[PDB]
Amino acid sequence: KVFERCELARTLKRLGMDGYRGISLANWMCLAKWESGYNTRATNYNAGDRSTDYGIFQINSRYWCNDGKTPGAVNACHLSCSALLQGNIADAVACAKRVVRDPQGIRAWVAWRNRCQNRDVRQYVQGCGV
Amino acid sequence: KVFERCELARTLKRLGMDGYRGISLANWMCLAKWESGYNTRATNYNAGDRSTDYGIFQINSRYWCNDGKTPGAVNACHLSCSALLQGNIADAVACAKRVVRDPQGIRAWVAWRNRCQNRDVRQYVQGCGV
Amino acid sequence: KVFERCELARTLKRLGMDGYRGISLANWMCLAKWESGYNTRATNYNAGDRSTDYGIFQINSRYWCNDGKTPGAVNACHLSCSALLQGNIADAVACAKRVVRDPQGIRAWVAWRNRCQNRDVRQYVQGCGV
Amino acid sequence: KVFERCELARTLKRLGMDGYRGISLANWMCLAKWESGYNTRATNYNAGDRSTDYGIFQINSRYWCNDGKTPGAVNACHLSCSALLQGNIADAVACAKRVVRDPQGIRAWVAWRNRCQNRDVRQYVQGCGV
Amino acid sequence: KVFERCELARTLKRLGMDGYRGISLANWMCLAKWESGYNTRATNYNAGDRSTDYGIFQINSRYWCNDGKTPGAVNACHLSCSALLQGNIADAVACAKRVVRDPQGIRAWVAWRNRCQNRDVRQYVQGCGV
Amino acid sequence: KVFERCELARTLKRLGMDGYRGISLANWMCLAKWESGYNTRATNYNAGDRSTDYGIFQINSRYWCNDGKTPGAVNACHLSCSALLQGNIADAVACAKRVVRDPQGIRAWVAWRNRCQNRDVRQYVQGCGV
Amino acid sequence: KVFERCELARTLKRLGMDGYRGISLANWMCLAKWESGYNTRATNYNAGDRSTDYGIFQINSRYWCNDGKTPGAVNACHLSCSALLQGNIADAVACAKRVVRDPQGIRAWVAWRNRCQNRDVRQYVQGCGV
Amino acid sequence: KVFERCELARTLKRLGMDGYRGISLANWMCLAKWESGYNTRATNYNAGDRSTDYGIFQINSRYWCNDGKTPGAVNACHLSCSALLQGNIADAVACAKRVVRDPQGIRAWVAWRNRCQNRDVRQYVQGCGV
Amino acid sequence: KVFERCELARTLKRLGMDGYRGISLANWMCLAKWESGYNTRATNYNAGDRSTDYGIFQINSRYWCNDGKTPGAVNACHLSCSALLQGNIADAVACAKRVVRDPQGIRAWVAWRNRCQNRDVRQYVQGCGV
């Protein structure tokens, strides 16, 4: 028997949660491969009120670029005049007899098992409990 | 028997949750492969009121680019004059005899099993409980 | 027998939930492959009132670009003069004898099983409980 | 026998839920492949009142682009002069002898089984319960 | 026998739900493939009153573009002068001897089974219960 | 029996959580390979109020670049005139007889198992408990 | 029996958590390989209020670069005129008969097991407890 | 029995946590290989209020570079005119008959096991406890 | 029995944590190989308020470089005119019949085990405890 009685108080004006605006979860995972890279800000834990962050506060830019006006026989396969961009330029240009991405192989992800769990995600106010 | 009695109080004016605006969940997962990369801000945990963030607060840009006016025989397969863009430029251009993406292979995802679970996602206020 | 009696109070003016505006769920998943990348903001957990975020607060841009006026024999297969865009430019241009995407393979997703579960998604106020 | 009696109070003025505007669900899933990427904001959990977010607060843009006026023999297969766009430009242009997308393969999704479940999605107020 | 008696109160003025404006559901799923990507805002959980969001608060744009006036032999297969658009430009242009989309393959979705379930979606107020 | 009685107080004016704006989770993982690199800020833990960070506070740039005007026979496979960009330029250009990425191999991810767990993610206020 | 009674006080005006804006988690992991390198700031722990950091406070740059105007037979495979960029330039250019990345090998990730766990992630205020 | 009674005080005005803006976690790991190098600032522990750091406070740069105007037969495979960049230039250029990265070998990551754990991540205020 | 009673005080006005903005963790690891080198600042422990650090306070640079204008037969495989860069230039250029990186070997990471742990990460204020 976890407890005979609670007997918390002889008087009380309230018990419980007012204005609960919180967001709760159990975002745990069980996998074989994760790719979360290629970002401009990442995994930064900032505790405290009135936090602030800026990628670029101010940029007074004037800009000229020329990838053209080329009178030559062959200009090909080229990324050029890229600028003022906040983010990732990935696999931008490819020139090939054959291009492939992520071929999944022969019998390459077979018979893999997961047995992962949690008991509860609970936010509560109780006079006595277990 | 978890408890003989609750006997919490001799007087009370309320018990429970007022104005509950919270969002609860159990977003746990069981998988073999996850790809969540290629972002401009990611996995940043900011505790505290009045938090603020800006990707680019101000940019007074003037800009000229030329990828044309080319009198040459062949200009081909090229990303050019990209600019002022916040995000990801992926697989932008391809020139090939054959192009493929994600071929799924021969017997490449067979007989894989998952047995994953949770008990509850519960936000509550109770006088006594188990 | 979980409990003989509740006997919470001798007097009470209310018990329960007023103005419950919350959104509850069990968004758990069991799968083999997830692709959630290529975003401009992602997985950012901001606790606290009066939070604010801006992708670009202000941009006073003047802009000139030319991908034309080309008197040459062949200008082809090219992404050009892209600008002021917040988001993802993916697989923008392809030039090939053959183009394919996501071929699903031979016997490539066969006999895979899932056995995943949860017990409850419950927001409640009760005097005594189990 | 979970409980002999509830005996919660000798007096009460109410028990239950007033003004319940909440949205409840069990959005759990069991699958083999999920693709939720290519977004401009994603998976951002913002707890707290008076939250605000802007993709672009202000943009005073002046803009000139030219992809034409080309007197050359062949200008072809090209994305050009894209601008001021918030979202995703995917598979925008293709030039090929053959174009295919998502061929589903030979015996490529056969005999796969799911056995996934939940017990309840319940928001309630009860004096005593199990 | 779950309980001998409820005996909740000696006096009561109400029991039940007034003004219930909530929306309840069991949106759980069991499938093999889901594609929910290509959005401009996604999976953002905002708890708290007076939340606000804007895609673009203000844009004072002036704009000139020219994809024409081309005196050349052949201008073809091209997306051009796209602008001020919030959303997705997908598979915009195709030029080919043959174009296909989603061919469903030979015996490619055969004998797949689902056995998924829930017990209840219930919002209730009861004096005692099980 | 964890406790005979709680007997916390003879008088009380409240017990519980007011204005809970916190975000709780169990983001633990069990995997074989993780790639979270290629960022511009990462894993920075900043405790304390009024924290601030800037990627570039101010940049008054004037800029000229030329990758064109080339009268030579063949200019090819080149990234050029990249500038003023905050983020990652990955696999930007490829020129090959064949290009492949992430081939998944023969029997290369087979029979791998996970058995990982947690008991609870719980934020609560209780007079006595276990 | 962990305790006979709590008997904390004869009078009290409150017990619990007000304005909890904290973010809690159990981000522990069990894996075989992690790659978190290639960043511009990393693993910096700054305790104390009013912390500040700048990547580049001010840069008054004037800039000229030329990778063109080349009248020679073959200019190829080259990254050039890169500048004013805060982040990572990885695998920028490749010229080859064959290009591959991350081939996954033969039987190269087979029968690997994880058995990792935690008991709780709990932030709470209780009069007496275990 | 860990304690007969708490008997903390005869009077009290509060017990618990106000304004908790802290971020707690258990980020422990169990693996075989970690690569966290190639950064511009790393593992710097700065205790104390009003901390500040700058990568480059001020740079008044004027700059001219030329990698072109080359009339020679073959200029190839070269990184040139890189400048004013804060971050990592990795694997920038490759010229080869074959290029490979991270081949995963034959039976090279097989039967490896992890059995790692923690008991709790708990921030709390309690009158008496164990 | 760890203690008969706490009997801390006859009067008290508060007990607990106000304004807790701290960030706690258990970042312990168990592995076989770690590579955290190649940085511009590292492992610097600075105790005390008002700490400051600068990579380069001021640089008034004027700069001219030429890697071009080469009329010779073959100029190849060369990093040139690199400048004003704060960070790491790694594996910048490669010219070879074959290039490989990190081949994982034959049976080279097999049967390795970890059994590492911690008991708690706890920040708390309690009248008496164990």
What do you see in this structure?
The structure is a homononamer of 130-residue chains. With 130 residues, the first copy, chain A, is mostly beta strands. Chain A has a domain of 32 residues. Helices cover 0% and strands 39% of the residues of chain A. The first copy, chain A, is elongated and about 95 Å long. Chain A starts with 22 loop residues before the first strand and ends with a strand. Chains D and E meet through strand 1, strand 2, strand 3, strand 4 and strand 5 of D and strand 1, strand 2, strand 3, strand 4 and strand 5 of E. Chains A, B, C, D, E, F, G, H, I: Belongs to the glycosyl hydrolase 22 family. Chains A, B, C, D, E, F, G, H, I: Keywords: Amyloid, Amyloidosis, Antimicrobial, Bacteriolytic enzyme, Disease variant, Disulfide bond, Glycosidase, Hydrolase, Secreted, Signal. Chains A, B, C, D, E, F, G, H, I: Its main location: secreted.
Percent range of helical residues of chain A: under 10%
Strand/helix succession of chain A: EEEEEEEEEEE
**What gap, in angstroms, lies between the N and C termini of chain A?**
11 Å
Strand percent estimate of chain A? 35-45%
- Could you tell me the number of beta strands of chain A? 11
Q: How many H/I helices of chain A?
A: 0
Rounded to the nearest angstrom, the radius of gyration of chain A is 29 Å
PDB class: protein fibril
Keywords: Lysozyme, amyloid fibril, misfolding disease, cryo-EM, ALys amyloidosis, amyloidogenic variant, protein fibril
Assembly: nonameric
Entry title: Cryo-EM structure of the D87G lysozyme amyloid fibril
